[PDB]
Design a protein around this ligand. Structure first.
Ligand SMILES: [Mg+2]
Ligand SMILES: [Mg+2]
Ligand SMILES: [Mg+2]
Ligand SMILES: [Mg+2]
Length: 85
RNA sequence: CCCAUGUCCAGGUUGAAGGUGCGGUAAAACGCACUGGAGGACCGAACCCACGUACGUUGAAAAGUGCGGGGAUGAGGUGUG
């Protein structure tokens, strides 16, 4: 949702202007992915939506790889905040 | 054969489901351990049955004994009424 995405940007971002950043993107994608996994458990047959789920997941994984390359401290802080492995 | 009401099955073993935790995952299938303790499951006394063999065969016995044998928490054995 737009209000939830606003909250997530304001929380995880470095500024109120820095809408775009890896931590911001990943924080949005994780909530979207949780909603989609619940939707999939409720709608097991919607493979057409599971595809977009996997695409979002790959996007998040690539962002996380960029973070592991550039800033390992930022990476670990992010993952402690989010709860990912 | 059945009704009701009771009672008996030394000991040991294996280790189903379920559960928990750790991996693995985007989350799961899944895997690894532990727990748990199922079974007309296993080995084997009493208990029950009678596979073989020898002997007995005017028998110890109008159907047995010995040497081994099968089942042994179940569709079990047994008691009283
Ligand atoms: Mg048995
Ligand atoms: Mg036995
Ligand atoms: Mg008796
Ligand atoms: Mg006979």
């Amino acid at each position: 949702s737009q209000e939830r995405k606003n909250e997530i940007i304001k929380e995880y971002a470095r500024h109120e202007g820095d809408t775009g950043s890896p931590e911001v993107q990943i924080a949005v994608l994780t909530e979207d992915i949780n909603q989609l996994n619940e939707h999939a458990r409720t709608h097991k047959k919607d493979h057409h939506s599971y595809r977009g789920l996997m695409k979002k997941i790959g996007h998040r994984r690539n962002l996380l790889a960029y973070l592991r390359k550039t800033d390992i401290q930022r990476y670990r802080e992010l993952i402690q905040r989010l709860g990912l492995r």
